[PDB]
Design a binder for this molecule. Structure first.
Ligand SMILES: C[C@@H]1Nc2ccccc2NC1=O
Length: 112
C-alpha cells in the first residue's frame, strides 16, 4: 500500500468526523484552565486538532491507530462528564455518527 493515498484518506476521514461535531466541542484540547482537575483521571487527553498534528507527523500509519485516538476523544468525554450533561450525550452521538464514518473509510482503505 502507498503512503500518500492513505494519508489523503485519513485527512478526508478526519474532516468527516469533525463535521459530525457540530458544536466543535472536540476541535481543540479541553482547557485545563477551566477544568483544573481534568488530568486527575484522564491519562491521555485527545482532540481533533491534536489528531491532525499526529496525522501530519506520520504518526498514523494504519487505520487502527487513527481510530484509537478518535475513540479516546469519545471515551475521555464519557469518563469525565456526568451522564446528564450535554457533553456526555455529545460523546454518545459522536460515537454513533463517527462509527459509520470510520467503517466506510476502512472499507476504502482495505481496497488499497
Ligand atoms: C470535551 C469537553 N470540553 C470542555 C470544554 C470546557 C469545559 C469542559 C469541557 N469538558 C469536555 O469534556
Amino acid at each position: 500500500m502507498q503512503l500518500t493515498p492513505f494519508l489523503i484518506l485519513l485527512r478526508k476521514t478526519l474532516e468527516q468526523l469533525q463535521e459530525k461535531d457540530t458544536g466543535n466541542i472536540f476541535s481543540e484540547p479541553v482547557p485545563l484552565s477551566e477544568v483544573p482537575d481534568y488530568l486527575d483521571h484522564i491519562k491521555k487527553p485527545m482532540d481533533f486538532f491534536t489528531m491532525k498534528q499526529n496525522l501530519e507527523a506520520y504518526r498514523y500509519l494504519n487505520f487502527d491507530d487513527f481510530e484509537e485516538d478518535f475513540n479516546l476523544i469519545v471515551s475521555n468525554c464519557l469518563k469525565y462528564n456526568a451522564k446528564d450533561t450535554i457533553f456526555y450525550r455529545a460523546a454518545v452521538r459522536l460515537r454513533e455518527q463517527g462509527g459509520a464514518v470510520l467503517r466506510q473509510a476502512r472499507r476504502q482503505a482495505e481496497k488499497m
